[PDB]
């Protein structure tokens, strides 16, 4: 594999799309690789990690409990509810809803949680409160995946998302337990995580949330490192490519391979 930046360029050439990327030390925030780091990309499902950060902040404040059972109706369900559709009779706890949102990409779980934090406006306010002045959520699932060209709704920048993830995971804004919970939810991805492990060399740590959208939008927020440590945050977004999902996946994997082969920088 070539150097990370050279691979990123190749990916734009092959895909005819825009790639946005940040590689950042998790402990310190040192930026290692930055490409289109200040350009806007749709968050898609990656917003769910921020959402559950906001939920945990409420838990820490005594305004929420992870144990609290939420009951909902079939009419509340939106497209793709693999966990939440199974609990119309018995409900789900707030913590279970965050697990379903993050580890199973359950859209109804995400919307139920979004309601608890004051909707898209509330989550945007939370972002402003932790010092992210760029990322914005405007819509609910699944409209937030629309990825219209030039539409600022429901977008982040790679630099903003990386900084925000680091804030939630490490800055002591969240309690120790809450930081640990948010990390464990990302470790526990039931879909991409296990497949990624199968193709990672031995010794590489992975935790992640993936996302997809219209017009080729695709992305991942990940923790990655050798020696079985979450050494770095890697944020990669793609937009405005006509390519197959398989090729978008391949290109993101290729950027990963470049990082792995050229890790010491
Ligand atoms: O010399 C370094 C390594 O080179 C190869 O490893 C390959 C591996 O066989 C391949 O499967 C992976 O693809 C990358 C797949 C990563 C999956 C997605 C990555 C995630 C991580 C967070 C951001 C991007 C998405 O690349 C590495 C590096 O070339 C060798 O197989 C391995 O023995 C050796 O230790
Ligand atoms: C966010 O999670 C999201 C947004 C969105 C829009 C349309 C369709 C699906 N979708 C998701 N979730 C999927 C995603 O692609 O991120 C999931 C998690 C499917 O995941 C994968 O396909 C990742 C993967 C790639 C290659 C190999 C193995 C796994 S969801 O549909 O289960």
Residue numbers in the entry: 26 to 238, 240 to 252, 254 to 292
What's in the article?
Bacterial β-lactamases in Gram negative bacteria are primarily responsible for the inactivation of our current β-lactam antibiotics. Despite their similarities, these penem and penam inhibitors undergo different cyclization reactions forming distinct long-lived cyclic inhibitory intermediates.
The SHV-1:SA1-204 structure was determined at 1.53 Å resolution. In our study of the SHV-1: SA1-204 complex, the carbonyl oxygen of SA1-204 is positioned out of the oxyanion hole and stabilized by side chains of S130 and K234. Firstly, in this SHV-1:penam sulfone structure, the deacylation water is positioned 4.07 Å away from the ester carbonyl carbon compared while in the usual acyl intermediate this distance is 2.8 Å.
